[PDB]
Design a protein around this ligand. Sequence first.
Ligand SMILES: O=P(O)(O)O[C@H]1[C@@H](OP(=O)(O)O)[C@@H](OP(=O)(O)O)[C@@H](OP(=O)(O)O)[C@@H](OP(=O)(O)O)[C@H]1OP(=O)(O)O
Lengths: 414, 150, 1366
Amino acid sequence: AENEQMLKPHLHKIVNSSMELAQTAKEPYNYFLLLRALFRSIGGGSHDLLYQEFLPLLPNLLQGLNMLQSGLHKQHMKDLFVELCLTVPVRLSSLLPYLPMLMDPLVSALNGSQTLVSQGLRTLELCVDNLQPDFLYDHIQPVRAELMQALWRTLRNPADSISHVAYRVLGKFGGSNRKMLKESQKLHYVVTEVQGPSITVEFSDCKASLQLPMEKAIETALDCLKSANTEPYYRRQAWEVIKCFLVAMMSLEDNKHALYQLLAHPNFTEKTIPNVIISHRYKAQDTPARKTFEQALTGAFMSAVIKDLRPSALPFVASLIRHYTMVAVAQQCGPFLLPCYQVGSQPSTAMFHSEENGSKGMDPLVLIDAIAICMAYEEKELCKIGEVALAVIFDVASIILGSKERACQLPLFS
Amino acid sequence: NPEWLISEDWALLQAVKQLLELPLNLTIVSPAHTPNWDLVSDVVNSCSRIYRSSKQCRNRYENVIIPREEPLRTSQIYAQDENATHTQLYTSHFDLMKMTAGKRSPPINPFQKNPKHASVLAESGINYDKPLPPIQVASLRAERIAKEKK
Amino acid sequence: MTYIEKRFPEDLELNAQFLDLVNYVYRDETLSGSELTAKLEPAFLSGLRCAQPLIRAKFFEVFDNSMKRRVYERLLYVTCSQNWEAMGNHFWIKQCIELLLAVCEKSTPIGTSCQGAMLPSITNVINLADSHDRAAFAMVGNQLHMLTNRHDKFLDTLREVKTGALLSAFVQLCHISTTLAEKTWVQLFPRLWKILSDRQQHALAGEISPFLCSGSHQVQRDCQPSALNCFVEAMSQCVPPIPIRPCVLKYLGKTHNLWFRSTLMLEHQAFEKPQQEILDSLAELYSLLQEEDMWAGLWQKRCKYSETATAIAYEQHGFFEQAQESYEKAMDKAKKEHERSNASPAIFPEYQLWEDHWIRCSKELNQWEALTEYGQSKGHINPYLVLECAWRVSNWTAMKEALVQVEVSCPKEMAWKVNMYRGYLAICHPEEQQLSFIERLVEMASSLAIREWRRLPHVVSHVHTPLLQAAQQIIELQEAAQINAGLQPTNLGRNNSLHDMKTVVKTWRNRLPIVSDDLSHWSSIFMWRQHHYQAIVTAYENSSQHDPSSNNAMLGVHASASAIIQYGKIARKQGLVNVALDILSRIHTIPTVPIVDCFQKIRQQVKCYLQLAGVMGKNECMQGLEVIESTNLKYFTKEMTAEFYALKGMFLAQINKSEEANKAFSAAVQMHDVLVKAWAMWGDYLENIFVKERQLHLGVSAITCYLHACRHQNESKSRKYLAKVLWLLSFDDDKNTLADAVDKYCIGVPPIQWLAWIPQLLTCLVGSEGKLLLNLISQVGRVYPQAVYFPIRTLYLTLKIEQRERYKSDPGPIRATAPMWRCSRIMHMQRELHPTLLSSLEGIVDQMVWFRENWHEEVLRQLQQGLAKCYSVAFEKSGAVSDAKITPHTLNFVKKLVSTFGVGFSSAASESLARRAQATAQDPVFQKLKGQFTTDFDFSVPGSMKLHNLISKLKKWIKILEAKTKQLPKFFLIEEKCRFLSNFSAQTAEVEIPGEFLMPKPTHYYIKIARFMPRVEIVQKHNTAARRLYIRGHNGKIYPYLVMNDACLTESRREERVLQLLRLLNPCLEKRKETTKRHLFFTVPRVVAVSPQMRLVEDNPSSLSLVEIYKQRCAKKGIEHDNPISRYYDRLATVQARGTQASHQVLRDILKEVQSNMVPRSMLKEWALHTFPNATDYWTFRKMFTIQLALIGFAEFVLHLNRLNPEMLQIAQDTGKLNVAYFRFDINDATGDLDANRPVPFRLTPNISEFLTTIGVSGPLTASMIAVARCFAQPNFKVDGILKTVLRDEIIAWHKKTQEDTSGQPENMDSQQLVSLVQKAVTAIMTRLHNLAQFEGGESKVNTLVAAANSLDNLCRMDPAWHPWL
Ligand SMILES: O=P(O)(O)O[C@H]1[C@@H](OP(=O)(O)O)[C@@H](OP(=O)(O)O)[C@@H](OP(=O)(O)O)[C@@H](OP(=O)(O)O)[C@H]1OP(=O)(O)O
């Protein structure tokens, strides 16, 4: 009764300030928490005083929240956006001309966490109970495939109440819950026929052997190493899987004297380096082997960040980066030149491993793709290991070539 | 519940026999091949008569079969005793009832241009005998809209 | 073991202690105690599956040593000696993985057999190249020595890793993840099967089936990834797994989530051909899947008695009364045959089919009393049917006895049905009114329904429709709970309960099922609502004091009347008139009813008489007219009289009087000028009489009628009327009477209605009626600037290009034509009105001009089109000579091509692009290529003029170029040259995605282009290197588009017209039953022509073509895709070498050999099997393929479109949708009429039929074809008008093209020739549609059409370039 008079004059002010400042802020999280608290306070009870001043704020606020939740953001940020944009303290009577801007976040809330799917089903029941079926159907017509697919997926939710309310709203929809979906449901399919990487296993009891594919195994390892909910020993097992996959997918046919005689040649430090340009614009689609290699490499780089896995992951990662960069400089420099790196050559698919001829052996340039996808990872702590990888690459390149400025002409750096 | 037909009874016996187990004790060596009563239930209720295959009946009628299998054997009563006359008579009775139901089902130029339908229109103020062309009707609609606007 | 884990699951300490205790009991003192281990099996299993790794390890170490370390022994153990019942809803197959991977050898170096993906060592460069280079290299500071030493030490550390470290961690990883571990078993078990010898494999396969059953191993029935699912998937994924029983397959499919996998396996067994059990189980499983078409096809293949086929055909297309009559005739004939002699027991399934389908038909025909009398037969009481049909006739005692008889023997799948029946009983029983357990029953029913839902496939389909329908009746029972709670005398009359009752009644009135649902569900809903409506009515008859206004009883009366009327309307829509008359006789038996709903009842009656007046008889139609005239109009309103007179005029125009009908139409329109339907029908009649008598004073009237009908209504409805309006413009005279007529009464019609017909009115823009149509298009454009700017832009540029060729003699600029100035003044006005939006559109169009890529793919596409035309012309010379000479036109084409070879508004982008082209044209590579080509492509030498010599040289150059063009960029950044596109933002202009204004949408949520994605990929599609552009919107989604360079301004404009036609026909498919029921719809991508040479088309990334899949399979096999055509032509030449012109047998054997040698019919089938490993995904893809193929075949046959070449059919892998590459009407260039009379009506080559497994054809394909034929055949849609409107401009362009060769006066074709030709053309399509729609006697010509589409006697005569084998 008394405090609503001092908050009303500043409502528009704080709303607009938080909306325009979080866009160019350093940690735009506390502002959205403040907005959520303000919405909760305005919705709590029937104030009927701040409602009049909040009504003219929906035209821009709803659009901004929709643009925010539609863009790519971290999981917690997206959850906060979708939950604060759905729980607006405004009655449906006035949200009619601004209702269309609530289906895009609704379909995401239905696909979100348990709290998010519950809030989405709550809003869906609220709008289907407080509005005529015809207008609501004409309203959801633009986005019906996603909404119905999410309502059908959440029906299998372990939570009994969630599935029950989902079934209740589906029955409330009536015949519209099964209308033809022009945007037909998507289904998984394979794009290539070549087999992915596998590990050889033998059986001495029957004098035979098998091949164990490990694409989905590496995928599971990376997935459980990325998430934070996994336990430490499972992370260690996944790191072990990735390490054995990495070490099993290389030749390991190098000698000490032979390596010394190969790297100790005057041409490596005297001959001009071919200035060919590497560009993924000519690179074909990623083969199963290459994507599995990238996944294993990024999983190793992540384990190098994991605290309990760092002591054994960081040295192995450094040594593997050394191996990759050394084989690269050996195949692309020295007296032995590949038919695609000689003088006068041009960019081509021979530099990358592809389903076509491509290169003769596995492309060592995949290490750069791993560092790229790691630095572009959602978590920024991974950028440290990427910088360490680049540092060791440059250092060992200058060591093997000397005259640091000369080691930068390698197409590897391009 | 309706009586069990010898056809579906032999079907049940065979389904149990096709479970690779003996009736002497229904857990034979390779104990993982426990009796799948739901499987034989599904295989039996696909016979002539109604489902009649709840959790109870499946066990009850097999326990009834065991004594008379350890008189004529079920396989003998199937191959013998008018092999296909029982189910065929059942189906003939069903079809006769069908025809009786379908038969007893029910089967399911006075020009009068009365003056009421024309008198209501005359009261409305429009002539029916003289068809007003659509152009004049459109002009009248435009004039009415103009009058309304003023 | 029993209680410690049940009551203390969270306290892992005591659980671990008990597990250590049992592990010690099992480990130590084994020689003393071995009987105690029998009862503690559940404890051991639980400790093995515990979440703690140490306990799991110490349990597995003792579980493994108890068995021999042999793969076969462990497999036999886990398959027949181990009982997993004690596990409990666990994915025990991971323990099988543990056991199978632990026995592997783990004392050897690690390695891999993937030699193709091997990574080269550091010293691998010492042996790759020649010898002496490395021999001389081998005979040639500390900072490098230390690095080498450390690297060698590290490599030595890696070489110590053994295989045992990999498998243990692999198993520990599979432990935590149920997904991607099921896959490991699926992918590893067949690998084990491969190494097992025949002796082991035989016994294992013989004992697996007992293990597939394994009795009490059913707790997994509710497990999402049930173990039996994975096990049977793995078993089926083996090579030799022949022995598996079909009964067990069906049982696993039903109980476990193995529906589609089980169906695929059963049909794979069935199509390999004592053996009828396979087909019986397959038909049962199909009937369980609600897939009516596959079941019908399978039975038609199995049908012995001819009557069964006709009955199934009738019931499949909604002919329920004729289906019931045919079933009755069939079972009567069977009874007669039985009286003659006994039949084989294999006929019993047909008898059960007849029984259950007659029951279903009688259920659909509103025979509830007959069904009750039948199920209640003394000798064979059918308690389920009685329980189903008892509550709908208020037989509550029979319903209660049937329920108590079913509750003890109800299928667990019908648990929610039993709960709903128990609720109905408790709510509606007279002497058992106990409203204490209501919400509990609803909760239990919902839980059971959700549990059953969890047992269905993950991809929603017809299998899930029953539960989606049950949800509505369940929530209605929940609402009925409070309804009855409020109707009791304690709450009777209370306002709080009255408001709730009113709200619930309004919601019920506004909540309706869809027409796609069978009438059975509509009845189950409406009759259930009727009980409570009557209760409300009756409840307000003994409480005259409560609410003394005679309103709440009237509320229930009105609700019941409206529900009855809606049920009758739905029954009528589905094609039932007898049940409609029955319902009308029913509603007539009421003391009194409202006057508002009686008018609607009379309206439905006259609508029934209307739709029944197709072949109306004199007696029946006159009796209907008398019944109509007998209705009283005293206490009624005025608008109702208008509608009544309109319907009277309609019904009387149906008969050949035409005078009283005109009078009634005029009187109705005068009664209520706002009535849209009356004026629309009046305009229809006026158009008819105008086309017949040809009186000028009637065309203006018809156009005014159509316009006034289109004024105040929605665009979806008014579309077919604007279609009629646009066609009438071809009858105007020199005075342009109807032109001024339409120009005088156009003020008032919404402008959005013309968006779907902009192209139709643009063609008239160039006629003598220009100025008024220009004003009209400009007026409608003032609201939609882009929708009118893009088409006028394209047409203006095409006119300028055409004039450039018309004035070849005059150099420099030239004067503009009349249509040019006309359509450019409007563009000037638009720029004056919408400057920012049009400027942004111009910027976009000028930036996308940079997509003129290069000469490489340009000349590639040129020579591809050349080869295509060469083959098309050689097929004509095939049978005659086949040693033919190149035609003059093809010679000129190839000459111009090899001469230009790629290099052939006051803007500056075009100038910069030309400068860049001239710059890049200074390299020696392309010059040498041009020289080498010109030194070969010359025709002035003898022996080179032969057509096949040219074809061979073209193929050689095609191979050379495709080997050359394989080194080019695959994507480029948009910011490289397209600055305005990269800098584009929502703040610049509110421009919408192209192709949005084409079809108006009810809502205004049009996704605006937020920004253009930086990457622009290059994809090889349509035999050209198209540029794929990605555009992002404010919603976060991305839309891909192909900036296609047409290079032919006529063919593209004629191609994108059938797309508009199909888009216009798409709504109609969604307004009828048997079409929505089958999900029939045209997949029409969006195509907008931005210039004569360039057009922007929508697409999706994963969309292959038939030729793409064929050439992919060939490259996999390592052969050339041009081999079969060359072989056909070689056989043709070698046969004609002895003067014998190739006969029919020659073509037949050529087809047979090319199919058996290099093109097996099982190519597409194996491709689909490999592409979609999941059974559900494969089944969904195949069903979508079948339905879309049927739809497009019906389209290409009924609509005289060009032959569906294999490269045209696009096949979307992500959804299975089938869209073709821009069909076009094959109008004869000589005669100007449609002559789509090829030997094959539609593409059903052997490969397709093999992919459709020969039953998808006989079922869903022909079923969908018949449905879509009967759908468009309905007169209410007036598809003939749309066809006429499109063919008008399709023939105007033909005339323009035919008259351009000779040489405003010639701007108009004729006043009588164009109309006559259009009428001749449209009838050719209408007759072909009616021939397919005919469904007399349960038989249709579609069967003979599909049979001829795959007959070898006709396929061999098709063009080799058409690929009758692919
Ligand atoms: O729904 P009904 O009352 O039975 O009649 C409808 C109605 O037209 P009317 O209500 O004016 O008769 C439809 O349109 P809506 O009113 O539902 O939007 C539609 O007619 P349109 O074709 O004009 O959309 C349809 O017709 P169809 O069967 O062609 O879809 C059908 O009319 P019928 O009486 O022919 O069923």
